[PDB]
Amino acid sequence: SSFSFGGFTFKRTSGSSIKREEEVLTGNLQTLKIRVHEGYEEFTMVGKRATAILRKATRRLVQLIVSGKDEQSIAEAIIVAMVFSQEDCMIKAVRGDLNFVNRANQRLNPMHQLLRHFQKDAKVLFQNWGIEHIDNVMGMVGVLPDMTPSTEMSMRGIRVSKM
Ligand SMILES: CN1CN([C@@H]2O[C@H](COP(=O)(O)OP(=O)(O)OP(=O)(O)O)[C@@H](O)[C@H]2O)c2nc(N)[nH]c(=O)c21
Ligand SMILES: O=C1c2ccc(S(=O)(=O)O)cc2C(=O)c2ccc(S(=O)(=O)O)cc21
Ligand SMILES: O=C1c2ccc(S(=O)(=O)O)cc2C(=O)c2ccc(S(=O)(=O)O)cc21
């Protein structure tokens, strides 16, 4: 399967899923209804400024390896992937209310609301995702919550690759 989300063409390379409508609670205890894809899947994300390779289990990002033009372009893809993954820590990183009433937001489903929320500011999302020690595996660097490259540590599951 092939589809678009957040400016990225996703192509499924492995795995399969069944979709199911589900409720989640934000960090502000707001209920959002999202369509959850159940099953382990692997995708290539093709964007105009970044490309990535995404592994996900149900509502869990397992791994993201991102290549791109620069910090912003690569963060853009990291944010898209984190939202797409539908992980609870991404949803718990929403600390205030999401506005479904105002006219400019009527086009947006909860998934696109979340995306927009993290595009405006990814700080809380990145801080609360979690961190891990990494290996010196080559071409690949870790990236810290402030998007600084690291050879020791990285946001959980996330690697930045050289072009
Ligand atoms: C989390 N997602 C989302 N997604 C696909 O990404 C596209 C983006 O749409 P979406 O806004 O998440 O949901 P969608 O089903 O289209 O609309 P809605 O739920 O508002 O009725 C859709 O084609 C959707 O099927 C996915 N596709 C696969 N294969 N696996 C997944 O985990 C996911
Ligand atoms: O808070 C929401 C809301 C929450 C979740 C979804 S859903 O995720 O599309 O099911 C959708 C919505 C809404 O569409 C909506 C419309 C009107 C109000 S109200 O004016 O605060 O009563 C709240 C909301
Ligand atoms: O094997 C790779 C490698 C393979 C594929 C890509 S890709 O272009 O992103 O697919 C990228 C890469 C790399 O960026 C890279 C960097 C450094 C080494 S090293 O000389 O063994 O240190 C190997 C590699």
Give the structural domain span for 120: 1-163
- Helix axes 71-84 and 110-120, enclosed angle (nearest 10): 150
Please name which ligand lies nearest the alpha carbon of 53. Answer: 3
Judging by DSSP bridges, how do beta strands 149-150 and 60-68 pair with one another? Answer: unpaired
Judging by DSSP bridges, how do beta strands 158-161 and 60-68 pair with one another? Answer: parallel
- Run of H or E including 111: helix 110-120
Tokens representing 53 are 């390779």
| Structural domain count of the chain | 1
The one-character DSSP state at 81 is: H
Contact by Cβ (8 Å): 73, 119:
no
Distances (CA, A) of 99 to 29, 106, 111, 126: 14, 9, 13, 22
Map tokens 């400019």 to a residue.
104
Tokens representing 142 are 């870790």
Could you give the angle at the alpha carbon of 132 between the alpha carbons of 116 and 112, nearest 5°? Answer: 10
Whether 138 is in the pocket of ligand 3, judged by its Cβ within 6 Å, is yes
Please name which ligand lies nearest the alpha carbon of 136. Answer: 3
Q: How far apart are CA 34 and CA 29, in angstroms?
A: 15
Nearest to 50 by CA among 36, 70, 32, 34: 70
**How far is the centre of ligand 2, averaged over its atoms, from the C-alpha of 99 (Å)?**
8
- N residues, the chain: 163
Q: How far apart are CA 92 and CA 24, in angstroms?
A: 9
User: Distance from CA of residue 31 to its chain's centroid?
Assistant: 20
**How far is the centre of ligand 1, averaged over its atoms, from the C-alpha of 111 (Å)?**
8
- To one decimal, the resolution in angstroms is 2.3
Structure determination method: X-ray
